[PDB]
Structure 1
Amino acid sequence: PGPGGGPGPAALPDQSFLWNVFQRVDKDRSGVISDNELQQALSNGTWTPFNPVTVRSIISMFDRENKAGVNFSEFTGVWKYITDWQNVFRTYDRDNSGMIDKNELKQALSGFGYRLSDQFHDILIRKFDRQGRGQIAFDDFIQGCIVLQRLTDIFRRYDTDQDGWIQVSYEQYLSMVF
């Protein structure tokens, strides 16, 4: 009872719709949406710029030809990815506040397959809650979840017997923490 089960949060509009959207986000009309243009399109709902770190992660996830951006085709992937996350967010934002608190966060993660202690959720919030109020906004929710799934993979490469425990040498410790 330790690790983090199945993955997480990742298609109804036609191409024209999404092509028109693409054209708007792509302000310089360069043909490619950059970290900066995407950010201005996204909304964390807290009136602050969408967590740039998350935008980066989202960009390099759908950008194939390392071009620090995405083209139309890949964008529809970004569109879907952001959309699936919003649905996840609203599902667990139970008191309809627009922010995910600790109780909701435990529900989100439990629902993703994670089996983490209560204490850990305080750490998780403090770590990714930029707002600094114990209420996680949309963008910090994605990032925290990406980092969890991104670190759970690494852990699994090491936990050969997937028992939730591993023995590491000082270096490996740093190497994997790096």
Structure 2
Amino acid sequence: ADQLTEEQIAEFKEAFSLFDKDGDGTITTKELGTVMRSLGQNPTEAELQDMINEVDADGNGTIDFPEFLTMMARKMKDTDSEEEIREAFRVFDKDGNGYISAAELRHVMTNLGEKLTDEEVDEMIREADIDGDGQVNYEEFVQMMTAK
């Protein structure tokens, strides 16, 4: 009985709406450009178009639910999980002090488009606060991610 991996694909369905602010089922270089500024800056509608062209399975000019998933598994495979972790940590550590912070976690979730209480941010720290210092250090951050 060779089962499938559709269980993981369900998670990407719930994340797709977060990336598509219009909830119309498709993301356009203009919409994603807002996320790029939050990471550092906005690319260019010319260059943004080339990125979608290599991932456009149909060639319509936009990324659909099934097209977005194929690119995700293709990028991580040719890349290493160690590389995506280093990039994500650097994005959360805006002040670059060695660890994150309650204010650092809340700034990204709100910037992403989700509303949570300050208590919601504190618990996130508890999950990676093995030493009990109230802050997540670099070592605690990687261990919790590769715990299993």
> TM-score, normalization: structure 2?
0.42
> As a proportion of its length, which structure holds more helix?
2
